[PDB]
């Protein structure tokens, strides 16, 4: 769907900012995003608990699909 296509492009952007890790860290968000937007992401991204998880790992994929994608499923 069009919403999924947009969300995937956002996911791809976060993935680059995360250096191709499957999650992103708060320090990477603060490094790359405007402070208000970094804080929003730090507060609202769900924790990443998949393979390779670490304390503080943030699930940018789930966050992006909820915000821009086909979220009502």
């Amino acid at each position: 769907s069009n919403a999924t296509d947009t969300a995937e492009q956002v996911i791809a952007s976060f993935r680059i900012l995360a250096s191709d890790k499957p999650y992103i860290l708060a320090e990477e968000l603060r490094r790359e995003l405007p402070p208000d937007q970094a804080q929003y992401c730090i507060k609202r991204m769900p924790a990443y608990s998949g393979p390779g998880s670490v304390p503080g790992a943030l699930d940018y994929a789930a966050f992006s699909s909820a915000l821009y994608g086909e979220s009502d499923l």
Binding site: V10, I16, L33, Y40, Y68
Partner: peptide, 20 residues
Amino acid sequence: NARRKLKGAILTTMLATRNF
């Protein structure tokens, strides 16, 4: 409105600030 404005700004940051 608040969420709509915030997510539009984030979309600009994520898609329209780097040459990705």
